[PDB]
Design a protein around this ligand. Sequence first.
Ligand SMILES: N[C@@H]1CCCN(C(=O)CCC(F)(F)F)C1
Ligand SMILES: N[C@@H]1CCCN(C(=O)CCC(F)(F)F)C1
Length: 460
Amino acid sequence: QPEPDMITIFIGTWNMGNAPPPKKITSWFLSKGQGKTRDDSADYIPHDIYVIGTQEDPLSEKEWLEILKHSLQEITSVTFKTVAIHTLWNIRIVVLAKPEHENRISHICTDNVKTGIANTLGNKGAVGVSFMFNGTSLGFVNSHLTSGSEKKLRRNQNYMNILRFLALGDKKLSPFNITHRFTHLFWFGDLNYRVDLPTWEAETIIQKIKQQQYADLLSHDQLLTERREQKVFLHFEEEEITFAPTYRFERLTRDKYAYTKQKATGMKYNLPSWCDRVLWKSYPLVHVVCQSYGSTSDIMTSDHSPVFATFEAGVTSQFVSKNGPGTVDSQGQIEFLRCYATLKTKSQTKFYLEFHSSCLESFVKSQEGENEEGSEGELVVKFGETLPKLKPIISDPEYLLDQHILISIKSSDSDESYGEGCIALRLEATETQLPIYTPLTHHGELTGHFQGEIKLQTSQ
Ligand SMILES: N[C@@H]1CCCN(C(=O)CCC(F)(F)F)C1
Ligand SMILES: N[C@@H]1CCCN(C(=O)CCC(F)(F)F)C1
């Protein structure tokens, strides 16, 4: 029985509006409705992993697990295994996998983050799950961010708190937040970004939706505009949106958007918006392809419609050689030439690098770099040819070219990371000097760049 080099992953997000679901929700798991939808010829083909995020979920974990498992069994005739379930207040994540994957999955972690303070602490935040699937790390975040059209900055703050404080994946990756810990990271939920147009344009917006003309609405979507200005979700992807706004509907139909201010809304308008979203970030040069992104048309218990997204995702096997794991393979090495970090910091400490990778027995600390002043004000930290030679556990190019090196640049004075990034070893050539590059971030904001050259030696 061969190990897979690809899997498919279903991501669902649904704000259930504190109402039980209807008796049939299979269209959600089949990616049928509006947008980029899944071919009918695939309906019986189970996804490898289903990740379900709910918000305003009124059900117990038991109640929802029974609905989800029975739904997937009806679709696929497969009885899925429960990988993980985690609930904060009414925010929930469920991970289900095909039974054949049970002994491919390990290191399962769950966590939550509560956003806000006092007033604004009590119902928003995020839940997440991570695990290893053979050689590949997978992370999943379901967030319910702050509501309201005039709170985009609060949503951006909620995002930064979640990526700082959600404790998933390998704790040995201490300088790295969740935006660097996984081969593939999926972040979804009721992110609550709105279409920023004047209230008076409500009926115009509805018109446009009825005509399936989304371009003039998407150009005012706060998540797309905030992402363009690098205010949030830096270095994440989202498929093009080709489905109608998923909020705010009258319940029990999809024929009506309920946008007008009511006591029940705190006298706020809810112009039609794409509140419910799926984004991802994968390590450089790993296969990931969105195969569906859309909303259901036939699930109408909530004022939100469910959103689905599906992905092909590259995975690797749990590699064993005669040497590593348990030793190094002297036929492998990773060298760095002419490397330098460019940092936005105004500080003057010395810096050193840490290299982290599951291709190393443990992380590697460099010597301090040499600080110079850039011609436009910047700090340039030069490592020259001084960086340590990295000794991978396995030299086989079928393993090594699939790996990645995480880099942290740390202050000698405080040992605090000023920037984190990632380099792929999926090179065009071995035993050849090749350019490398990563942006550096800290708390998910841009702090600098790392560039230089790499020389990778494999057993071939
Ligand atoms: N093909 C690259 C993928 C990642 C960043 N890129 C964007 O165009 C981001 C646009 C926005 F505004 F949606 F963020 C380019
Ligand atoms: N532990 C690995 C499993 C698969 C391939 N391997 C061998 O064939 C080892 C041969 C010898 F001579 F070391 F025993 C190494």
